[PDB]
Structures are given as structure tokens and as C-alpha cells.
Amino acid sequence: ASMKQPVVVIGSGLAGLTTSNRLISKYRIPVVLLDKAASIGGNSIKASSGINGAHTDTQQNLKVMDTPELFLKDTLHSAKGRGVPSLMDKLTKESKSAIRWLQTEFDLKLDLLAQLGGHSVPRTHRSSGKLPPGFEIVQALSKKLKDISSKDSNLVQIMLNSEVVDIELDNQGHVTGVVYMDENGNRKIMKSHHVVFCSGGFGYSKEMLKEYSPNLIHLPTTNGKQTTGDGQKILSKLGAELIDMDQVQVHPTGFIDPNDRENNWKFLAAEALRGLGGILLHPTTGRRFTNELSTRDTVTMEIQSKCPKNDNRALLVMSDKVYENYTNNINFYMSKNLIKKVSINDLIRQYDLQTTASELVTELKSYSDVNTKDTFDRPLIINAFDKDISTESTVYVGEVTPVVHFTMGGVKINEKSQVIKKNSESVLSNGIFAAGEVSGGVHGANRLGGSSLLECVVFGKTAADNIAKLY
Numbered sequence: 001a002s003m004k005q006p007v008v009v010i011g012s013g014l015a016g017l018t019t020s021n022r023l024i025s026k027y028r029i030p031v032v033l034l035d036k037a038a039s040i041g042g043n044s045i046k047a048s049s050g051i052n053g054a055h056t057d058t059q060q061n062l063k064v065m066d067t068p069e070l071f072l073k074d075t076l077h078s079a080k081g082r083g084v085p086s087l088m089d090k091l092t093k094e095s096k097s098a099i100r101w102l103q104t105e106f107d108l109k110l111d112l113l114a115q116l117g118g119h120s121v122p123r124t125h126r127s128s129g130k131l132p133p134g135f136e137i138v139q140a141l142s143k144k145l146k147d148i149s150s151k152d153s154n155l156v157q158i159m160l161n162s163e164v165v166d167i168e169l170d171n172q173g174h175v176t177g178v179v180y181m182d183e184n185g186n187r188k189i190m191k192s193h194h195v196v197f198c199s200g201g202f203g204y205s206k207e208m209l210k211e212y213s214p215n216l217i218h219l220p221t222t223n224g225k226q227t228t229g230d231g232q233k234i235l236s237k238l239g240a241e242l243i244d245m246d247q248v249q250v251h252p253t254g255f256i257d258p259n260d261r262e263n264n265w266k267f268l269a270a271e272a273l274r275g276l277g278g279i280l281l282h283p284t285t286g287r288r289f290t291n292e293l294s295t296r297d298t299v300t301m302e303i304q305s306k307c308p309k310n311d312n313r314a315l316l317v318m319s320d321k322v323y324e325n326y327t328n329n330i331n332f333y334m335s336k337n338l339i340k341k342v343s344i345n346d347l348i349r350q351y352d353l354q355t356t357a358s359e360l361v362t363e364l365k366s367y368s369d370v371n372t373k374d375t376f377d378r379p380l381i382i383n384a385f386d387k388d389i390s391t392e393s394t395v396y397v398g399e400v401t402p403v404v405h406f407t408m409g410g411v412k413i414n415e416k417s418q419v420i421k422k423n424s425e426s427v428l429s430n431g432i433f434a435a436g437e438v439s440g441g442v443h444g445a446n447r448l449g450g451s452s453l454l455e456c457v458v459f460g461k462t463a464a465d466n467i468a469k470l471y
């Protein structure tokens with residue numbers, strides 16, 4: 001394109017980074033990326049499990065069969081009759097293209113799989129190596145922007161510590177500008193005709209939880225302090241439709257930090273830790289109590305009922321085989337005191353469990369024997385405990401508890417990533433787009449692990465492609 005006013009991208013998580021890279025690399029359309037935080041990446045940079053895609057080269061390599069239709073069925077089942085099905089179709093159908101875009105344009109390997117809760121087959125992609133998926137993907141995308149930016153400063157500028165507070169519209173009402181508070185707290189206007197909200201969720205905000213799912217106000221969260229629903233509020237005040245705001249995901253396994261047990265913020269215990277063979281033990285009895293690989297709403301429901309009302313936590317216990325497959329990530333968790341390597345005798349005594357060591361050994365042996373059916377009917381049992389485990393064998397243990405993690409609702413969007421006007425199917429403004437967690441409609445009542453990184457890519461790409469038509 002010929003260079004006009006910049007496209008303002010609000011938020012440097014994966015949604016904003018996708019949009020920015022696509023605009024600049026494919027179309028040479030200039031971007032200003034604003035983020036109210038002091039660093040790049042949002043909650044995206046913390047993602048530990050990976051990115052979904054159905055019918056990928058990775059899946060072909062690992063001989064896993066999967067299809068857009070299977071992914072959509074898992075997605076609809078998870079949605080429980082909420083959401084916009086056509087956006088679910090788009091998410092799942094364009095998932096192959098999303099993975100391929102990351103692999104080809106950024107040389108991200110995305111060569112390993114995990115099967116997460118609610119998924120019929122393994123389709124959550126991460127790269128081998130020392131770097132977890134959120135960090136790897138964000139670093140690759142951001143480094144590409146910073147490269148371009150060092151080279152033609154007018155094609156891309158990243159401005160941190162810049163909090164958007166409103167969009168300026170004319171009487172018609174086309175976008176004319178983005179109002180933001182700069183690093184010194186001064187009001188500034190960025191003139192623009194096109195803005196993409198990639199500003200993330202609202203899970204950290206107690207005030208918004210009070211408004212939309214007030215039962216969750218006392219729960220801890222995995223979200224960063226920036227996750228305050230700014231975009232959703234701005235766009236609502238401007239006349240945008242919000243949907244599914246009362247659908248908040250509580251992930252069952254936030255880590256408890258044994259040196260800061262009541263922190264309202266938690267490190268996440270990656271769902272991959274269960275997908276790859278971790279089990280959950282009741283914190284008093286020392287026994288398994290539920291299916292660890294259900295959807296998040298279900299696992300969370302079971303811990304909240306079956307673990308103690310006061311002291312609502314569980315023990316995530318992982319064998320040596322899980323350790324071999326998720327070594328760098330368990331190493332990180334151990335360096336932070338979140339996972340401890342302990343013998344079975346010591347587990348019992350350290351965690352004050354009612355079970356004897358010998359009793360727990362008999363139970364881990366039954367769990368691991370796939371010739372006996374699972375007490376709680378777990379759909380995938382891989383990387384279990386060794387047939388000859390004893391009370392002296394070592395296991396890896398962490399304490400986990402339910403945490404506010406993702407907001408499925410948000411501003412309503414169409415298939416072009418355009419924000420929809422309240423009480424209408426028309427766009428609020430041909431200039432206003434949204435992608436990622438700030439949007440609503442894509443997941444319905446529960447989001448499948450892996451699909452938030454994917455939404456960011458699918459809809460960030462779509463916003464850029466559509467702005468390119470209009471620019």
C-alpha cells in the first residue's frame with residue numbers, strides 16, 4: 001500500500017503481534033503498536049501448553065489423525081450452546097493455516113504435541129527445546145517487528161507504557177484517532193483510520209468479575225495485573241455489542257507457591273502436565289479423586305467439591321516418565337519451588353497425608369495398569385508410574401488450586417474481525433477491529449486448552465487482511 005496514517009494495534013500479546021506482522025510484512029501498511037505495560041507480550045508470553053491446529057504437518061509426522069471437523073465437534077461440545085458457531089467453524093478450519101504460518105514465516109518448529117482436556121486427539125503444538133510456546137512465539141514475532149523497526153522506523157513503532165483510553169470518531173462515524181496516556185501520564189492522540197483491539201481479557205479485574213461472574217471474586221488468578229478489561233469497557237461505551245461476558249474460565253491447576261501461599265497471583269501448572277501423565281491426589285487422604293483430563297469447568301468443579309472447602313487444593317504428582325517429556329518446563333517449576341522431587345515415604349510425611357506409603361504404591365500401580373479400568377475413567381493414560389515402584393521411589397509433586405484464567409466473553413466480532421454494533425449486525429465502524437481474548441463469541445461456555453493462542457493467530461491475520469482491503 002501507499003503509506004497513510006498508521007494502523008493502531010492495541011496490545012502486544014499474540015493477537016497484536018500477529019496483526020502487526022501481517023500488516024507490515026504482507027502489505028507494507030504502517031503500524032503503531034501501543035501497550036500500556038512496561039514490556040511486550042501480555043498473558044500470551046506466559047502460555048505454557050501450546051497452540052492448537054487440526055490436520056497439521058506435525059500431526060501427519062506423529063501419525064495422529066485429526067480433522068477440522070473433529071476439532072469443531074470438540075469445540076462445539078466445549079461451547080455448550082453459547083458462542084457464535086460460524087466463528088468456531090472459522091477458528092478450527094483456519095487452524096491448519098495458522099500453524100503453517102508460524103512454521104514457515106518464523107521457523108517455529110511446533111513439532112511436539114499434547115492432548116489437553118476435552119480434546120479427542122492430541123492437537124496442542126509446542127516446540128522441542130528449552131522455550132515454552134508462549135514465550136517462543138511472542139519472542140519470534142516481536143523480534144521480527146523490532147528488526148523492521150530498527151530498519152524503517154516509519155513502518156513500525158512499538159510504544160510501551162501507553163494506555164489507550166478511547167477512540168475518536170467523526171460524526172459519521174469513521175475512526176479518526178486513538179486517545180492514550182503516555183509514559184508520563186499525558187494525554188495524547190494518535191491520528192488513524194483503523195484500530196485493532198488486541199487488548200486481552202478481564203480476569204484480573206475484581207470489579208469486572210463482580211459485574212459479570214461475582215462468585216469468582218475471591219479466587220486467585222494466573223493473569224497479569226494489566227488484564228483489566230479496558231478494551232471491552234471502551235468499546236461498550238462507544239456502542240459495541242458485548243457477548244458471553246459472564247463466561248469466565250477457571251483453570252483447575254494454578255500453582256501454590258509454598259513461600260507465598262495466599263498470593264492472589266499464581267504461576268500456572270500447565271495442563272500439559274496432566275495431558276502428559278500427571279495425576280491429582282486429594283490433599284488430606286493422598287488418593288486420586290477425579291478425571292484429570294476433562295474440560296476445565298469440570299475438573300475445577302470436582303476439586304471445589306471433593307477437596308476440602310477450606311484448603312481447596314490438590315497435589316499434582318508426576319512420574320519419572322512425565323519428567324522425561326516435559327523436562328525443561330518441570331526444571332523451571334522446580335527452580336521456583338513449585339514442584340518438589342520427593343520419595344513416596346516423604347510425600348506422605350511432608351504433605352501430612354492419611355494414606356500409608358505402601359497404600360499409595362498399590363494405588364499408583366493400579367492407575368498405571370491399563371488392563372484394569374480407571375476408577376475415574378481417564379481417556380488417555382501415558383507416562384505413568386513404573387511397574388516396580390516402591391515406597392522409596394521418587395515422584396515430582398506440586399500443590400495446585402483453581403484459578404481465574406480466561407474470559408471467553410468480550411466484544412462481538414464478525415468473520416472479518418470487525419466489531420459489531422450493539423443491537424445490530426452492522427459494524428460499529430469499518431475502522432474498528434478486535435482479535436484475541438478481548439473478543440467474545442469464539443469459545444462459548446468453556447475454552448479448550450490451546451485455542452487461545454490459536455484465536456490470536458486466526459483473527460489477528462484476518463484483521464490485517466481485512467484492513468488491507470480498506471486501507
Ligand SMILES: Cc1cc2nc3c(=O)[nH]c(=O)nc-3n(C[C@H](O)[C@H](O)[C@H](O)COP(=O)(O)OP(=O)(O)OC[C@H]3O[C@@H](n4cnc5c(N)ncnc54)[C@H](O)[C@@H]3O)c2cc1C
Pocket residue numbers: 010011012013014015016034035036037040041042043044045046047048049050051052133134162163164165198199200201222223224226227228230231267268405406435436437438449450451452453454456
Ligand atoms: C499463565 C497462562 C498460560 C496460558 N497458556 C496458554 C496455552 O498454552 N495455549 C493457549 O492457547 N492459551 C494460553 N493462555 C491464554 C493465552 O496465553 C493468551 O493470554 C490469550 O490468547 C490472549 O492473548 P491476547 O493477545 O488476546 O491478549 P494478551 O496476551 O493478554 O495481550 C494483551 C495486551 O494488551 C495490553 N493492554 C491491555 N489494556 C490496554 C490498554 N488500555 N492500552 C494498551 N494496551 C493494553 C496488555 O498490557 C497486554 O500486553 C494462557 C494464559 C495465561 C495467563
